[PDB]
Design a protein around this nucleic acid. Structure first.
Length: 451
RNA sequence: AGUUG
């Protein structure tokens, strides 16, 4: 057994056998990170099992290092600094890092035990990883453990917690504001706010400060310098993307949650193209995980969860289901077998196994595009499967008249590397590379040939 | 749009 806080000295050998997938369904704040994860690793080390620990974000990656600090782990994430000898039999990294390395042809370790945390992560690389991991188990070469408070099929947005939570439905400002929302500022406790956009996050954060509030901003850009500020520093507000949706222990008093986001959607309707639909409600899983950031401390029983509107369970129009098969179809077991999606995530969309399998030269270009070009999974596949070399930027211009990209109501021109003036007009449309102005700047850099 | 290297 164990006291509150220390890991259990007893661990089921049940979970370490090959051909055995395990789903740990514990509710938020039950201590899968602070208690369970250490003892899984401690026992895995004892059994000398080559172990992989996958985290969805650098936030979860950080909260792991605290629990596992001192153990002989190799941390392969820019979120942790470790002194590693190189003889560790345990590797820690992010979901997408592992999918990346599977795709990047250099070979990866034959892990005996694979513990994925937050196994509900809807990221296309993450979904692909579960496909690989489930397949590795099914063939009997590995033991896997899928930890998540919101497993596939979870729909309750208000699950059990260490402390009572006051659920409150109030209208929430998507933008800056100046009067009507007095309850926001008047709250004399900490608050974690979940904004959809980094920008929507700064028009809010730079409005909260006007009322003399200390506001930390958290996202992929500012994680390294602002996340440790959350912990040992006292603050008023934390405005965050859903980089903190899972894992983060903020020790706050309230969660504000508009429950909205944009989502990539593949259109079958006409020529195929990707849009940025929304703003639309998040999923039952997400809302529960934003809510989970509070109500964790049993000594603090007046935590609040202000939210807005119902979540939407239906996410089949989302492109990450198609993009996940696109990634997974280009991954192989040593034994040759094509990895099939984790069973629970099977048939989220029309799929034929191997529909997206590429050949030779194409596969590397597809991987190359996602890495060297920062292009989305969909856009990369479409371009690569057309038999296009990675450096061949001709396709950024030979699209039809409707594929002309506009910026500030004017047709985008691109001065190329050899110096021609050609109109930006991609053969395939993906809104993710031209919606946000800075995303379009990158795409203008790409089509120039400066990427 | 987020996220990961």
């Amino acid at each position: 057994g164990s006291a509150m806080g220390e890991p259990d000295y007893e661990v089921d050998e049940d979970i370490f056998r090959k051909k055995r997938l395990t789903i740990m369904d514990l509710h938020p704040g039950a201590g899968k990170t602070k208690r369970i994860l250490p003892s899984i690793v401690r026992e895995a080390l004892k059994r000398r099992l080559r172990t992989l620990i996958l985290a969805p974000t650098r936030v979860v990656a950080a909260e792991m290092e605290e629990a596992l600090r001192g153990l002989p782990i190799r941390y392969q994430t820019p979120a942790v600094k470790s002194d590693h000898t190189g003889r560790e039999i345990v590797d820690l990294m992010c979901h997408a890092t592992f999918t990346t390395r599977l795709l990047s042809s250099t070979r990866v370790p034959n892990y005996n035990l694979i513990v994925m945390d937050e196994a509900h992560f809807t990221d296309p690389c993450s979904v692909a990883a579960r496909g690989y991991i489930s397949t590795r188990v099914e063939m009997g070469e590995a033991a896997a453990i899928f930890m998540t408070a919101t497993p596939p099929g979870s729909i309750d947005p208000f699950p059990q917690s260490n402390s009572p939570i006051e659920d409150i439905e109030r209208e929430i400002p998507e933008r800056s504001w100046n009067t009507g929302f007095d309850w926001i500022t008047d709250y004399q406790g900490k608050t974690v706010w979940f904004v959809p956009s980094i920008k929507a996050g700064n028009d809010i954060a730079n409005c909260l400060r006007k009322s003399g509030k200390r506001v930390i901003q958290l996202s992929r850009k500012t994680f390294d310098t602002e996340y440790p500020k959350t912990k040992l520093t006292d603050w008023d507000f934390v405005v965050t993307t859903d980089i903190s949706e899972m894992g983060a222990n903020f020790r706050a008093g309230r969660v504000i949650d508009p429950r909205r986001c944009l989502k990539p959607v593949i259109l079958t309707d006409g020529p195929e193209r990707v849009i940025l639909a929304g703003p639309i409600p998040v999923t039952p899983a997400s809302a529960a995980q934003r809510r989970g950031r509070i109500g964790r401390n049993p000594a603090q029983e007046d935590d609040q969860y202000v939210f807005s509107g119902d979540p939407l369970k239906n996410d089949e129009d989302h492109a990450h289901w198609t993009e996940a098969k696109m990634l997974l179809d280009n991954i192989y077991t040593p034994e040759g077998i094509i990895p099939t999606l984790f069973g629970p995530e099977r048939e989220k969309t029309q799929a034929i196994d191997g529909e997206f399998r590429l050949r030779g030269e194409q596969r590397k270009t597809f991987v190359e595009l996602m890495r060297r070009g920062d292009l989305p999974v969909w856009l990369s596949y479409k371009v690569a499967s057309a038999g296009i070399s990675y450096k061949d930027r001709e396709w950024c211009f030979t699209g039809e008249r409707n594929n002309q990209i506009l910026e500030e109501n004017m047709e985008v021109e691109i001065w190329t590397r050899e110096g021609e003036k050609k109109k930006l007009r991609p053969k395939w449309l993906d809104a993710r590379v031209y919606a946000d102005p800075m995303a379009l700047k990158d795409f203008k850099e790409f089509a120039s040939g400066r990427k």
